[PDB]
Structure formats: C-alpha cells, structure tokens
Amino acid sequence: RTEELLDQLSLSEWDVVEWSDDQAVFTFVYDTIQLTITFEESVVGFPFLDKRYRKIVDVNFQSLLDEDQAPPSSLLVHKLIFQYVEEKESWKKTCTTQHQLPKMLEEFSLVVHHCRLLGEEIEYLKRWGPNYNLMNIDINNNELRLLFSSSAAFAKFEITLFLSAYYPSVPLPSTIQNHVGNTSQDDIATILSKVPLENNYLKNVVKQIYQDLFQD
C-alpha cells in the first residue's frame, strides 16, 4: 500500500496486447476495459510510416465486465469511466494520428486510475464500515448512499453523495435524509469541506463523520 502509493505517481493502468499494421489494442482494469485503435490502411508496413502522419481510422472503447456477476462497486467504476469517454467523445476529434496516442492514453489512464481506486475504497468501507458506524452502503446510478447508525450517539441518518468521473478532486454534492437525532445539511457541508480533494476522499470523509459525530 505505501509501496504502491509511490507507484501511483507514475501511472501504469494499461497493457499493450496488439501492435498490428491494422490496429493497436490496450486493456484496462484487469482487462475488463478494451481500447481498440484502428489505423488507416497503407501499401507499406508501419515501420515505414512516420507516426506523426499515420492516420487513426477509429477509436473504439469497450467494457467487457460481466455485469451479472460484478459487484456494485465494480459496476460504478465502469459507469464513471465511460461517462468520461462519453464526455471526450472517445477522443475522436483530437486523437487522429498515432503520434497523438500516448497523450490520450495518459488522459484516460488518469481517470481510469482514480475511478478504479474509488472502487477499492468502496469495497473497503463495505468490510470495515461498521467501525465507522457506517451500517450500509447503497450504490444507485452515480449516487452513493451512506447509512450511519448508533443508538449510543443517538444518531441515524442517510447521506447521499453524488459521484463523477472526476473524483476525487471535485467537491461532492450531498444530501441528508435524517432518521434519529438532528444532523443538518450545514453539519455535513462542514465535515465534507474539511477533507482535501485527493485520494481516499471517501474513506476520509467517512472517518471524518465517525469522529465528528459518533465519537463525541
């Protein structure tokens, strides 16, 4: 974990799996995401062609995740990653020659890299969440539903966090459905804005809630 966190600084999100005359293929996320780059056809091999002028015919992203078998966290990861691909239109207008491909794989890797880690934080909160009084986690379409419950603190409420592809730098939007006690929106706004927009924002925001509210 400390070892790899260092690893994160220089990103390594993809495997090259074909480098044809015809196409270059790259996988991501344990290979559940597949990028096929198709090149224009030529009368010569690509060894004879200048990469600054080799035209890209196509850019085709694919999810190969088993949606029946996947857990919700993994599903949310794919939801968010491809929401970004949609926004960038598969880089079809800007990534047009082979020359431009590394800066695209970088741009994409970064979002793949944070979204995959968000997946990780969720599976974690799913196993240690009780210690934070986080009794349940519900994922529904870009919405993260956190249920905190403690008789002892006499508080029970549900916080809904709205996630995007751009995690975790963007400040999350939230709402609170209150069950027991009187935690207000302002109390939540506060706790959130005291956590920096960098890795583990979810984990840290949960721990922040568990101190501010369940450890008085």
Partner: peptide
C-alpha cells in the same frame, strides 16, 4: 481482483 472484476464468457 478477478473476484471483483469478472469477465463475460
């Protein structure tokens, strides 16, 4: 984590 990231058959 193949567990969490299964592939279509």
């Amino acid at each position: 984590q193949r567990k969490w990231y299964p592939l279509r058959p």
